[PDB]
Each structure stands twice: as C-alpha cells, then as structure tokens.
Design a binder for this molecule. Sequence first.
Ligand code: CL
Length: 232
Amino acid sequence: MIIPALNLIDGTVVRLRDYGNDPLPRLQDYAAQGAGVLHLVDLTGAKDPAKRQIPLIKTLVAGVNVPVQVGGGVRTEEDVAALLKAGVARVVIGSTAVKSPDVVKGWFERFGAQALVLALDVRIDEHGTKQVAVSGWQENSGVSLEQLVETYLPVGLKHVLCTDIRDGAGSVSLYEEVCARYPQIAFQSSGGIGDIDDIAALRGTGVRGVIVGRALLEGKFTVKEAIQCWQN
Ligand SMILES: [Cl-]
C-alpha cells in the first residue's frame, strides 16, 4: 500500500515550508483516490506533549473513512490511550521505543500490536550496520535495527516504520534485507520519495507500506498514480 502523510503544526500543513491549514480536504482527497491508510505527524505534540493536537486529530479522523496512524512525541501510556480514544487507528512510537523498550512492550500487552507502529530512524554506519537513532539530529543510540526489532518480537510486533536518515532521492538494499529477515513483520518505508520512480524501486523489496509526504504536496504525482505504480 501507499500511505499518504501530512505533518501538522498548530493545524498547519508543513514540510520539514507552509502548505496551508486545511488538512481535512487534502486527507479526504487522498482517501478518495484509493488510499487505504493515512499517516499524520503531530509536530506540535512532538515539541510539547501538553499541546497535543487531539481535538484537530479527532476531527481529521472522523472526516475520513480510512485508518490513520498518528505519531509525534508519544511518551506515555496515557498518550497512546488519548490518541486511540480520539479515534486514531495506530499510534506511532519513535524515541520512546528506543528509550524505554520494557515500558513499550507493556503497551503492546495492553493495546495490542495492531494499535502500535514502531518508527525507527536508521543510519547505515561505516561498518555497514543499520544503527537506530531517535532523530536525524542526534547521535546513534547504540542499538541496531535487528537488535531492536528482536526485542519486540516476543510481544507480537507487527508494524515497523523505517526511515533511512533520504527523508525529504530514492529509498532499496536496506529494505530488502530487513524485510527478508522478518517476513512476519510489515515494514513501512519513509523518506526519499521524490518521484514516482522512487516508489517503483521499492516494488519487489518486501516493504509493505510506502509513506509519501512531500512529493504529493509538491504535485510530483498523485496518490492515484502512486497506487498504480505500487500495484504494478
Ligand atoms: Cl497491500
């Protein structure tokens, strides 16, 4: 599947530049073109968890007919719960999944693996290792993609979002390897989609979902075209 994505600050659609502040029409049109899943980054909430755009998220989710994954500074059990209650389908967890794996495994137990997506930023280092980092501007955290995935497999890990820190050029080698290694996990790719051929390269790799943000906002291609390409 293609997974169209928006980034939101104070209700404004942004790139990580300003793309207006009417996210709901955009999302609805994404769904209208055949999107089966959408993805939102709450950048405000990522900055300040007290400022979580819950009420906007509620309206957005209510306004489409497809599951929305939402992430952005999710730190607590109560964060997950509040997002789910607002109607989000899947909560996307990034830094906390790296920071507090035993706590997050507890979340898998409470909420179920279908409600959670682990988002891992990956740097391939000098030695060829897929290093996990909590963000593009912090150093590697000292754990490989494989090591962290295998930490969560015992609690039924199903959804992993993997960003090669590509984001915002083409995404292929990395994805072929990890998808082959863990065929029971549905990997999503993020970052590096600049043209429709970037989507093409990911066909065959075993990646299950392709996150597309910027390129849709810049009119490079449409969601419908993305889906046609992805489905071959
Ligand atoms: Cl599919």
